[PDB]
Each structure stands twice: as C-alpha cells, then as structure tokens.
Amino acid sequence: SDAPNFVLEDTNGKRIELSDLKGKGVFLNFWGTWCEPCKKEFPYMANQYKHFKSQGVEIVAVNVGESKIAVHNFMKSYGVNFPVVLDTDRQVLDAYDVSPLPTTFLINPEGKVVKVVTGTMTESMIHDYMNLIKPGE
C-alpha cells in the first residue's frame, strides 16, 4: 500500500514532503519524548544512519505534537543526527492510524510500505530494517 503523503517542517523549519523522497528508502518513525524506549532506539538509529545515509536510506522521525523546544532538547540529549519533523497537531499520526508509540513504517524506494514495526527494536533489527529498504549497493 502507498504511504500516505504529507508535508511537515523539520526542526530547522525546512519543508519536508514524503513524496519528495521517492527513490530512497524511508525509515518513517513516529515518536514522542514520553517514549522511554526512544532514549535507547534514537541513538541506535543515529548510529546506523552513519552507514545507511550514504546507502540511500533516509530517516524521517515524526514527533507527535510536542513543541519545537521540547523536541530539540530530546534530540540533543539522545544524539539525534537525522531528520525530525513536527506533526504539531497529530494529523499525520492520525492519517497513518498509529496507536502504539513508537511505530516505524519501512517504505521502499517505490514509496510503498513494506513493513510496519512496533515494540522494542534492537540495533541489529534497525540495521536489518534499513537494509530491507535501501535502494542500492
């Protein structure tokens, strides 16, 4: 199924449209600072991103309704080095019908969702998930 398109601003105020990432694999992660597991998983995602960014995998971590400052503080505290967007009114979350947080939609270069992941992700799992959606090499 096609991943619902959306437009949100990243933490730097830059406009990000999902459809603009076609051709690349997208690790679409919905999260909140109240998700303790993200304190563990974000560093893992950042560590793997050091490798997969140059493999054509992009991460779009959609924060669910929190302020720019609260998000920026969490990014600084937990070593984020990947794109984070602000779903200020939770409309994108609702569009994806996401309930458990965090939830990750693995989107292939075609823009189709190939897997939906929820629950604890080890760094090994995150590594394998990024390998699943990478466009080449």
Decide: residue 17, CB within 10 A, 0-12 exposed, 13-18 middle, 19+ buried.
exposed
HSE toward the beta carbon, residue 52, CA cutoff 13 A: 26
What's this structure's resolution in Å? Answer: 2.0
CATH code of the domain in which 55 resides? 3.40.30.10
Distance (Å, whole) CA 61 – CA 129:
15
Domain count, the chain: 1
Distance (Å, whole) CA 73 – CA 26:
24
Q: Are 16 and 85 in contact (CB under 8 A)?
A: yes
State which residues form the domain around 78: 1-137
Q: Are 30 and 90 in contact (CB under 8 A)?
A: no
